[PDB]
PDB file of N, CA and C in Angstrom:
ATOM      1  N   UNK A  30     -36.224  21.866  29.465  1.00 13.29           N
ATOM      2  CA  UNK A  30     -35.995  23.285  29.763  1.00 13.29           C
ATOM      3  C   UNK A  30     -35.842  24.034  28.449  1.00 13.29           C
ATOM      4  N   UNK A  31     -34.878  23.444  27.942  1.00 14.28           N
ATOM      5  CA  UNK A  31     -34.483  23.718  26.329  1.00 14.28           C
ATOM      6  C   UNK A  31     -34.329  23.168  25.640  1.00 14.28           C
ATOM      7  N   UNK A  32     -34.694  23.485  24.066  1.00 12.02           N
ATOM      8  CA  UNK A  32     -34.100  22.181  23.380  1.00 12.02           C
ATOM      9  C   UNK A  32     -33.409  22.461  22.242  1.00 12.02           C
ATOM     10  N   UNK A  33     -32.147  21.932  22.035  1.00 11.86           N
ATOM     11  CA  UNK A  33     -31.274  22.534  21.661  1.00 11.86           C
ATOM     12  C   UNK A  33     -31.005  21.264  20.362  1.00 11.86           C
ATOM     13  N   UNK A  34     -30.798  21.346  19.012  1.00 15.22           N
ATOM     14  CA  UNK A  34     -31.331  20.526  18.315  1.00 15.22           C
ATOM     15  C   UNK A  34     -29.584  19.490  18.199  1.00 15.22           C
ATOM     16  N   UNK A  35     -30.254  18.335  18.797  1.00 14.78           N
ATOM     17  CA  UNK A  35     -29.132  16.745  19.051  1.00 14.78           C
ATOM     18  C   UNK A  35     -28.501  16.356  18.005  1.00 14.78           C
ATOM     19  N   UNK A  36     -27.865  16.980  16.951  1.00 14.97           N
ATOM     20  CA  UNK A  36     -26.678  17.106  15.851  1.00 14.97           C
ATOM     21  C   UNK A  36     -27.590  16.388  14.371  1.00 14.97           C
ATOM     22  N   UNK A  37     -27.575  17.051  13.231  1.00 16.42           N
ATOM     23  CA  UNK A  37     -27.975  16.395  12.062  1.00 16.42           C
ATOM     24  C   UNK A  37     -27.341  15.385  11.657  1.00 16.42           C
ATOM     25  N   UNK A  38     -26.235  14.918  12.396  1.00 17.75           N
ATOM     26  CA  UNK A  38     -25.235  13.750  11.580  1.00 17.75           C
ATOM     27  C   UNK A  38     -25.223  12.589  12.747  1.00 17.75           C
ATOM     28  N   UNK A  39     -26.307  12.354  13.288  1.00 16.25           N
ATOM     29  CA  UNK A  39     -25.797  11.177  13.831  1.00 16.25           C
ATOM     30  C   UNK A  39     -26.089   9.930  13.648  1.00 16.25           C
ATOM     31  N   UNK A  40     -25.681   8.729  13.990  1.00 18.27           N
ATOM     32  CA  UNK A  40     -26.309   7.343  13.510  1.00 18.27           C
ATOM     33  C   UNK A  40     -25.880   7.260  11.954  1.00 18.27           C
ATOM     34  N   UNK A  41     -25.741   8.176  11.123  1.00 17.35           N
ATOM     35  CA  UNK A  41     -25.141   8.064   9.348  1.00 17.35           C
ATOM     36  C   UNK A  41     -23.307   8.818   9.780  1.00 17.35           C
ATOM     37  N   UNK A  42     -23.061   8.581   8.945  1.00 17.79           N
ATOM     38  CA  UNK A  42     -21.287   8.922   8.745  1.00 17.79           C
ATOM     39  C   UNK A  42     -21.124  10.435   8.299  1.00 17.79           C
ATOM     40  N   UNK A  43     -22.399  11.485   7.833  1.00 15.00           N
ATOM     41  CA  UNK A  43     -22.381  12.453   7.445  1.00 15.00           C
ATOM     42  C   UNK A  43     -21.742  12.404   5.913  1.00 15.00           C
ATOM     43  N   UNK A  44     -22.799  11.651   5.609  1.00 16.63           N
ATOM     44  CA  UNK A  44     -22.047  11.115   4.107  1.00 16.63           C
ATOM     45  C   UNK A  44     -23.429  10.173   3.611  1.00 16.63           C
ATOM     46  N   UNK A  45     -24.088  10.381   2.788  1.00 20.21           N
ATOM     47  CA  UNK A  45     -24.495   9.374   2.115  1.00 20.21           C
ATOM     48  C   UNK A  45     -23.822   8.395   1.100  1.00 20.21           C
ATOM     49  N   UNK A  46     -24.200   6.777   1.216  1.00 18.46           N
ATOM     50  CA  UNK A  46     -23.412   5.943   0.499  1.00 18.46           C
ATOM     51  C   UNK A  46     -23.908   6.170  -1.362  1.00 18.46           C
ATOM     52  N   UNK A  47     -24.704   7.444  -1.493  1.00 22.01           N
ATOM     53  CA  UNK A  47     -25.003   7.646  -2.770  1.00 22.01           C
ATOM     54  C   UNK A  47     -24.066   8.956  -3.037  1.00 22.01           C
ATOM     55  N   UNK A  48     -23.845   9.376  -4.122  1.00 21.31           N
ATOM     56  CA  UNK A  48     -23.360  10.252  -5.151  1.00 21.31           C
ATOM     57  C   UNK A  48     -23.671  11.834  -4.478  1.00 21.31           C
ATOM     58  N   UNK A  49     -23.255  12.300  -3.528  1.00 23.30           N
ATOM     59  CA  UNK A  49     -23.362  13.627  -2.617  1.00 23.30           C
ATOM     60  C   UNK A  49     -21.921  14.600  -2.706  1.00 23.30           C
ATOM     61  N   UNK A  50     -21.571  13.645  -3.500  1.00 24.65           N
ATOM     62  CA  UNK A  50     -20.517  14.926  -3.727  1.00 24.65           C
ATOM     63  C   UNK A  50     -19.600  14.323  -5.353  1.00 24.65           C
ATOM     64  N   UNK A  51     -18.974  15.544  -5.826  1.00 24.51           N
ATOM     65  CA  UNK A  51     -18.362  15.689  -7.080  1.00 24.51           C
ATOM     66  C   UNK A  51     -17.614  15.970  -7.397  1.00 24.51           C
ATOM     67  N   UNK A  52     -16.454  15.057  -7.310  1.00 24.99           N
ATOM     68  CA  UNK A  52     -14.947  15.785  -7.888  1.00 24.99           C
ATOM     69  C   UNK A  52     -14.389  16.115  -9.052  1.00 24.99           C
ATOM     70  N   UNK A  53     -14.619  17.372  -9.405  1.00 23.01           N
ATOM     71  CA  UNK A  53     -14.025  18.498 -10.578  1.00 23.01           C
ATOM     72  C   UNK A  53     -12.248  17.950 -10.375  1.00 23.01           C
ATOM     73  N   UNK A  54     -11.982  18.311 -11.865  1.00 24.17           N
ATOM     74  CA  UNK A  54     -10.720  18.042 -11.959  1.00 24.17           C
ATOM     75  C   UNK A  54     -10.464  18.631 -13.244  1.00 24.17           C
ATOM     76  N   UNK A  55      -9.541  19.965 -13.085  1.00 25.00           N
ATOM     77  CA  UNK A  55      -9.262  20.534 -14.251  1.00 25.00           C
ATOM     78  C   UNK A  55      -7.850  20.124 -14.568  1.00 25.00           C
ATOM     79  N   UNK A  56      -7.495  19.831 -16.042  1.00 27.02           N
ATOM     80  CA  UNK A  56      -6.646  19.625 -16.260  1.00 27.02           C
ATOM     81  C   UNK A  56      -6.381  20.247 -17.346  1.00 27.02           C
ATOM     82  N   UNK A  57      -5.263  20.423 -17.904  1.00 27.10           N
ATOM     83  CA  UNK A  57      -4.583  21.297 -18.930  1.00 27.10           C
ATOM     84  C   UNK A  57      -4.658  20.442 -20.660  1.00 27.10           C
ATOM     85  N   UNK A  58      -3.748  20.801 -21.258  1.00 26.73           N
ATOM     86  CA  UNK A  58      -4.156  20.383 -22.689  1.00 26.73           C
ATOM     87  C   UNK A  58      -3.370  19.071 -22.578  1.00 26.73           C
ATOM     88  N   UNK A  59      -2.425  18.816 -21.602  1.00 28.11           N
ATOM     89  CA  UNK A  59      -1.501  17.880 -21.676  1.00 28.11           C
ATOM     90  C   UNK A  59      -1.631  16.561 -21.052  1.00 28.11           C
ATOM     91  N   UNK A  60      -2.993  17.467 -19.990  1.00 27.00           N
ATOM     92  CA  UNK A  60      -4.123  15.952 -19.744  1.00 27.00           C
ATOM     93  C   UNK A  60      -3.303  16.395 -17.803  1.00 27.00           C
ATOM     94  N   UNK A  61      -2.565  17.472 -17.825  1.00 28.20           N
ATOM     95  CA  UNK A  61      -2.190  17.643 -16.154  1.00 28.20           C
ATOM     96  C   UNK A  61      -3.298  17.532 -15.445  1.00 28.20           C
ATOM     97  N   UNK A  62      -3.620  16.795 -14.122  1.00 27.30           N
ATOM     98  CA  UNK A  62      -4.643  17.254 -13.600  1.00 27.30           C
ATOM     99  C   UNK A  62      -4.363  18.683 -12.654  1.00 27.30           C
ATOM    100  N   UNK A  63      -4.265  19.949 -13.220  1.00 28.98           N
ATOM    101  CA  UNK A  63      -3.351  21.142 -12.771  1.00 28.98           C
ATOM    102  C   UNK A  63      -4.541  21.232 -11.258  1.00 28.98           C
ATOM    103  N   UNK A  64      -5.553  20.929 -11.129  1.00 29.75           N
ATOM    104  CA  UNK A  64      -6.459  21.264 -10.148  1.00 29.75           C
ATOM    105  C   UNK A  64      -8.061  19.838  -9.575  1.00 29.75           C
ATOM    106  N   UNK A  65      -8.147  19.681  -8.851  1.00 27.91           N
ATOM    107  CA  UNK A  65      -8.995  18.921  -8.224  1.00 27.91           C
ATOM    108  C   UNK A  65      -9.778  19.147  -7.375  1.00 27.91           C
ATOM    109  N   UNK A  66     -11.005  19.303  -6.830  1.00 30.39           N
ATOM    110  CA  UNK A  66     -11.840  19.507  -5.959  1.00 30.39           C
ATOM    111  C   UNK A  66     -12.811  18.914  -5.700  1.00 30.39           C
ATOM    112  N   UNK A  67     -13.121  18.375  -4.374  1.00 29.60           N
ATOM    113  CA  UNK A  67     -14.510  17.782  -4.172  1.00 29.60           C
ATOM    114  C   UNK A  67     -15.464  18.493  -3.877  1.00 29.60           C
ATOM    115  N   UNK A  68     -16.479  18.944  -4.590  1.00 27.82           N
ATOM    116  CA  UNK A  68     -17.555  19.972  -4.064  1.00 27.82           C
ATOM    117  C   UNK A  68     -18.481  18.990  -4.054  1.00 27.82           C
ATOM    118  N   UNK A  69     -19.836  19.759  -3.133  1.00 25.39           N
ATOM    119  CA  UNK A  69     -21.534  19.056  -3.043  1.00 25.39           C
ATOM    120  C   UNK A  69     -21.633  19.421  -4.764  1.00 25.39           C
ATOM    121  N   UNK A  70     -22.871  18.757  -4.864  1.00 27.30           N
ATOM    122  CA  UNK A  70     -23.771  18.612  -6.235  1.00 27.30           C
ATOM    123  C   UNK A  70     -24.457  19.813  -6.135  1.00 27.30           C
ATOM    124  N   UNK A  71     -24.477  20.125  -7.537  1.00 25.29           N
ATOM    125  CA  UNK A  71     -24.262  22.043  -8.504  1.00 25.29           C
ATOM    126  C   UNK A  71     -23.748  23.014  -7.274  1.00 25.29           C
ATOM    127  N   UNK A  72     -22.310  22.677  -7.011  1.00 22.95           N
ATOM    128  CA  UNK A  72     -21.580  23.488  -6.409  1.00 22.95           C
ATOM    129  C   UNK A  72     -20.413  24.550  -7.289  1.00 22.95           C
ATOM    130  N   UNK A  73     -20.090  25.466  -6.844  1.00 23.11           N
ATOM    131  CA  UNK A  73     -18.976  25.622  -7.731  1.00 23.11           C
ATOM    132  C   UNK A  73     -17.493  25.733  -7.430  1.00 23.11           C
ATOM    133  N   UNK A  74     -16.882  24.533  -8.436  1.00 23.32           N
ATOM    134  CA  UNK A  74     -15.550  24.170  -7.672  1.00 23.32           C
ATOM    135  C   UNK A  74     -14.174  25.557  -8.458  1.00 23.32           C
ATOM    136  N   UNK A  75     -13.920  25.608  -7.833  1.00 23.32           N
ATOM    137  CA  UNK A  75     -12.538  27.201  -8.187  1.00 23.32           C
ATOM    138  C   UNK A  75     -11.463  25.858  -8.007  1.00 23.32           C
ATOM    139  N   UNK A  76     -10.836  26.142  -9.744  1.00 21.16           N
ATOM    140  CA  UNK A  76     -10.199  24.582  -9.801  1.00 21.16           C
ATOM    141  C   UNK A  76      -8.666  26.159 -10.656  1.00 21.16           C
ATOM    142  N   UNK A  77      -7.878  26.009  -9.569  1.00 24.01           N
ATOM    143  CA  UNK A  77      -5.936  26.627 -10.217  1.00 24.01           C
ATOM    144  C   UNK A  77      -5.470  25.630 -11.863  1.00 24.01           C
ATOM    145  N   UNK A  78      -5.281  26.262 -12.331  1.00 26.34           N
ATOM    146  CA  UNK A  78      -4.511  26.198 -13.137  1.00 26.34           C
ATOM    147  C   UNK A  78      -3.282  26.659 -12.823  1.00 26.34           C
ATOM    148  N   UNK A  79      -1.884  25.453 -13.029  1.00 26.17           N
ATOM    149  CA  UNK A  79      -0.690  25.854 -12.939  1.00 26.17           C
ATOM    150  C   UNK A  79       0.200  26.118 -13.677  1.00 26.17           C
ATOM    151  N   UNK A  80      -0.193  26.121 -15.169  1.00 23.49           N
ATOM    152  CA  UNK A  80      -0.198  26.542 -16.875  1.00 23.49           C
ATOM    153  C   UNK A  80       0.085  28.069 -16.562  1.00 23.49           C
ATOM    154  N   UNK A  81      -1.006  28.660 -16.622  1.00 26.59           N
ATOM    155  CA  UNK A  81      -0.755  29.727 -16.616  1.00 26.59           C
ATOM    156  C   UNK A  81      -2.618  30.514 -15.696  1.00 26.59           C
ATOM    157  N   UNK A  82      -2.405  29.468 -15.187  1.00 22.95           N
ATOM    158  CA  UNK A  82      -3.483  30.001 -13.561  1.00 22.95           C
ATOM    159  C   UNK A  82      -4.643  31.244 -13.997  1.00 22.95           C
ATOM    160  N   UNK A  83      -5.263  30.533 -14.816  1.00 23.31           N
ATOM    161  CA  UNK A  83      -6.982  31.096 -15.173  1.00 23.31           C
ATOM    162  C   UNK A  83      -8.414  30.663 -14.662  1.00 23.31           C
ATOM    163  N   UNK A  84      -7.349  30.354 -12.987  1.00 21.14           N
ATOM    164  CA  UNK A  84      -9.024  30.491 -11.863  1.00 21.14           C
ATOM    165  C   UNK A  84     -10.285  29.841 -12.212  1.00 21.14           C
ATOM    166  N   UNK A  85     -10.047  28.657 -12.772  1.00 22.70           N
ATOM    167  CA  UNK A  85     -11.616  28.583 -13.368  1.00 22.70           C
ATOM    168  C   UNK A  85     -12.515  27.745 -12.576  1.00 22.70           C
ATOM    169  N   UNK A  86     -13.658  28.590 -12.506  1.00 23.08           N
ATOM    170  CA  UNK A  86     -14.715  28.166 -11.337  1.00 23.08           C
ATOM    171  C   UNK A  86     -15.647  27.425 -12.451  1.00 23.08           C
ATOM    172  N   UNK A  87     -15.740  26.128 -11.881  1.00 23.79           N
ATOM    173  CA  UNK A  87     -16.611  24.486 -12.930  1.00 23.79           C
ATOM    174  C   UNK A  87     -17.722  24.814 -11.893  1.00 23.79           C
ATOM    175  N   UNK A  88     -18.605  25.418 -12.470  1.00 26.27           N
ATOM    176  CA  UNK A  88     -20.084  25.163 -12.015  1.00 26.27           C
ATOM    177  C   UNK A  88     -20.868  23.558 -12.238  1.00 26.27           C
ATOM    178  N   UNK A  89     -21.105  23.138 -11.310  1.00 26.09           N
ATOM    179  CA  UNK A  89     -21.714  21.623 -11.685  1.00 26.09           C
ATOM    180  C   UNK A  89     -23.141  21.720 -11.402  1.00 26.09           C
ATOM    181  N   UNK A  90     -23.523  20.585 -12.085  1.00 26.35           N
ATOM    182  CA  UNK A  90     -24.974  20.445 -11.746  1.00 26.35           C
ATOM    183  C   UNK A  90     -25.405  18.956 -11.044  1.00 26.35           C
ATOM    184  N   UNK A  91     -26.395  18.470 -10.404  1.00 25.76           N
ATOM    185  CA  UNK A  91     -26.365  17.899  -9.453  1.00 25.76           C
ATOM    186  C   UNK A  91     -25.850  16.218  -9.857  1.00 25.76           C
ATOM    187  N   UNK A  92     -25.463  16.259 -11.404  1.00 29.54           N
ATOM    188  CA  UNK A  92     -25.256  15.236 -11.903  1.00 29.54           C
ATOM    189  C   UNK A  92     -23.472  15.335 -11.475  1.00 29.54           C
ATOM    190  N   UNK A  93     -22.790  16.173 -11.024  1.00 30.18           N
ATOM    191  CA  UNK A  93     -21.693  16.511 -10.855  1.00 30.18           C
ATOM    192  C   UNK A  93     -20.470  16.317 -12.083  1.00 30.18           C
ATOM    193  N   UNK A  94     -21.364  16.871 -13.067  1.00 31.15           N
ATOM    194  CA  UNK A  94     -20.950  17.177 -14.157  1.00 31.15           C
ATOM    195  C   UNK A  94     -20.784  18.671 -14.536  1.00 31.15           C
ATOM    196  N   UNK A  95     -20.144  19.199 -14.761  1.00 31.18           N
ATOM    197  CA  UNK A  95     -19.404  21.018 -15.168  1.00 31.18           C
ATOM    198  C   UNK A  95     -20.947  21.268 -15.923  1.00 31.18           C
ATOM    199  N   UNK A  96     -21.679  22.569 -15.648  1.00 26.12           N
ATOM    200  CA  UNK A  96     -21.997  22.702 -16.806  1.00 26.12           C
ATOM    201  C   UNK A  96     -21.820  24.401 -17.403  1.00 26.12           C
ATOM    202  N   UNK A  97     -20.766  25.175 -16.654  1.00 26.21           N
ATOM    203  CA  UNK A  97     -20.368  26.256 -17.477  1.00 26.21           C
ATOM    204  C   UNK A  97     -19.258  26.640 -16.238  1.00 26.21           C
ATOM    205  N   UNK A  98     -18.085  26.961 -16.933  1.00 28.69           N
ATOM    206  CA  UNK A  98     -16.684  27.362 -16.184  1.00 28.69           C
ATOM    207  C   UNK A  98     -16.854  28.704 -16.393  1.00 28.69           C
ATOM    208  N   UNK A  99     -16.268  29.340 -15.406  1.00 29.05           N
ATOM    209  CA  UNK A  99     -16.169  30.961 -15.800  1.00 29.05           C
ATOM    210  C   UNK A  99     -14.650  30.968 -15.516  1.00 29.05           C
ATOM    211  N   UNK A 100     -13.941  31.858 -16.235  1.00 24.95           N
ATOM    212  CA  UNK A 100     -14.733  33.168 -16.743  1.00 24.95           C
ATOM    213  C   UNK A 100     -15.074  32.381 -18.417  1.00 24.95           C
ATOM    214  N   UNK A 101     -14.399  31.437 -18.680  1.00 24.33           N
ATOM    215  CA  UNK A 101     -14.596  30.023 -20.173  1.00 24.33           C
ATOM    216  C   UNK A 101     -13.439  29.364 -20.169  1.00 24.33           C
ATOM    217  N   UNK A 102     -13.745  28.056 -20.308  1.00 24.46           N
ATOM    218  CA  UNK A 102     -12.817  27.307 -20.705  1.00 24.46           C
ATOM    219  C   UNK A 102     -12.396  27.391 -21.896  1.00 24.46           C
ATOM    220  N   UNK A 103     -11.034  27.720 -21.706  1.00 22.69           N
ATOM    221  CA  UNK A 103     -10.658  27.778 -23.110  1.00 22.69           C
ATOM    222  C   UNK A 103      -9.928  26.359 -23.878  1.00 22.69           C
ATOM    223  N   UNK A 104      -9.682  25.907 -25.050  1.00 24.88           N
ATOM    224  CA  UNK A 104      -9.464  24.951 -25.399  1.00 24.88           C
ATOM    225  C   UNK A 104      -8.494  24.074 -25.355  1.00 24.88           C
ATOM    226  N   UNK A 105      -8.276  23.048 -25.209  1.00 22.66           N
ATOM    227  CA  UNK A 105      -7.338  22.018 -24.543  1.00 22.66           C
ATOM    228  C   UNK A 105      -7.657  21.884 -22.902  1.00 22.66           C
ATOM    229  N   UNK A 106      -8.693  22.394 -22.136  1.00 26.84           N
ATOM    230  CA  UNK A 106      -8.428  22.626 -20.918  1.00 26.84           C
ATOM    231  C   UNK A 106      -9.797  21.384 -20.771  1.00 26.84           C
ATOM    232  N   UNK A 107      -9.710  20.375 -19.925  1.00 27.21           N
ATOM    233  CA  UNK A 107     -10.578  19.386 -19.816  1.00 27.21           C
ATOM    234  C   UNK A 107     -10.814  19.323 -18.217  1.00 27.21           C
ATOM    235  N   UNK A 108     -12.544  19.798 -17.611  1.00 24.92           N
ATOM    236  CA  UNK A 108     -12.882  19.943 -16.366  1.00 24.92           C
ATOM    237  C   UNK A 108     -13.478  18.460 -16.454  1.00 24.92           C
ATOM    238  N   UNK A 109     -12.942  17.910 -15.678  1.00 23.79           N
ATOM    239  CA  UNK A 109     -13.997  16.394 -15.558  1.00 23.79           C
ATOM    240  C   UNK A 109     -14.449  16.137 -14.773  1.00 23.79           C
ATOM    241  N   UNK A 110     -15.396  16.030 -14.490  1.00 25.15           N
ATOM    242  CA  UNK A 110     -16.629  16.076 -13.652  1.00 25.15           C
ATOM    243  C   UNK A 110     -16.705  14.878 -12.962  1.00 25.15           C
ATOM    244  N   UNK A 111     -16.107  14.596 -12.796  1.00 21.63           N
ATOM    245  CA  UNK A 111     -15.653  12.514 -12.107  1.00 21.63           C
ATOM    246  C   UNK A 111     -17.001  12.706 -10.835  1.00 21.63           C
ATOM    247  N   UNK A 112     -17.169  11.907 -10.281  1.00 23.50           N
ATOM    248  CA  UNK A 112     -18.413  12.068  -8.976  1.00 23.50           C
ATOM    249  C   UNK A 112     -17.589  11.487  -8.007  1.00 23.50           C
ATOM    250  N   UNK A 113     -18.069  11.412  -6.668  1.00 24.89           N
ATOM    251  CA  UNK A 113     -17.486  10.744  -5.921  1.00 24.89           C
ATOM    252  C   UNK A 113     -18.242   9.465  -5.699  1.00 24.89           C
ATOM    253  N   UNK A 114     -16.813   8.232  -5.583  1.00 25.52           N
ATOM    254  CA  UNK A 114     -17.170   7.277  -5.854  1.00 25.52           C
ATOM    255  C   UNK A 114     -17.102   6.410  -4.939  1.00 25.52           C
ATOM    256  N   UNK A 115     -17.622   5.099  -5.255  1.00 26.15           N
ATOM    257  CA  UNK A 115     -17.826   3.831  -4.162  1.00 26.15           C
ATOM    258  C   UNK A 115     -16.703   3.752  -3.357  1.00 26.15           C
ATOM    259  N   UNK A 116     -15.593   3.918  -3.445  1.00 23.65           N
ATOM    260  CA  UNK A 116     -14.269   3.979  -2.871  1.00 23.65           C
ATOM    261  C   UNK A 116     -14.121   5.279  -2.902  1.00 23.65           C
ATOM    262  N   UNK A 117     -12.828   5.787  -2.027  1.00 26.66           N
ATOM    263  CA  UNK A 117     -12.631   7.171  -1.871  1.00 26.66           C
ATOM    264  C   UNK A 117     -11.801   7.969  -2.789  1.00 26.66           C
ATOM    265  N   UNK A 118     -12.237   9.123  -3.258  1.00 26.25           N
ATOM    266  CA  UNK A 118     -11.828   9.867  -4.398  1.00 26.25           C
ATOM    267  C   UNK A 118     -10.156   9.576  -4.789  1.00 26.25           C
TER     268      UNK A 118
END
């Protein structure tokens, strides 16, 4: 009668067992991890700072590696681009 499309996630976990997502992790000069996020690959993760909270959005690229923070990272501030891994983040 209709066809109404039977869900994109079924039979898989809605997850590939490869590298589909990227956890950003900003941390401060002191090595805090002040912020963490799992985004998809070249997503952009809005990672708090609790220093003194300069919003910084880690643009990644599909390697889920940062490749430009806005508004800038300023120095001592380390976004690490960790991926998500064989075990859970």
């Amino acid at each position: 009668m209709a066809a109404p499309t039977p869900v994109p996630g079924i039979f898989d976990i809605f997850k590939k067992p490869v590298p589909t997502s990227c956890k950003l992790a900003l941390t401060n000069g002191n090595k805090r991890e002040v912020d963490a996020m799992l985004l998809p690959p070249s997503g952009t993760t809005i990672l708090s700072d609790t220093s003194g909270a300069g919003v910084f959005t880690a643009k990644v690229n599909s390697k889920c590696e940062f490749t430009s923070v806005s508004p800038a990272l300023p120095t001592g501030f380390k976004i690490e681009g960790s991926v998500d891994k064989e075990g859970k983040p």
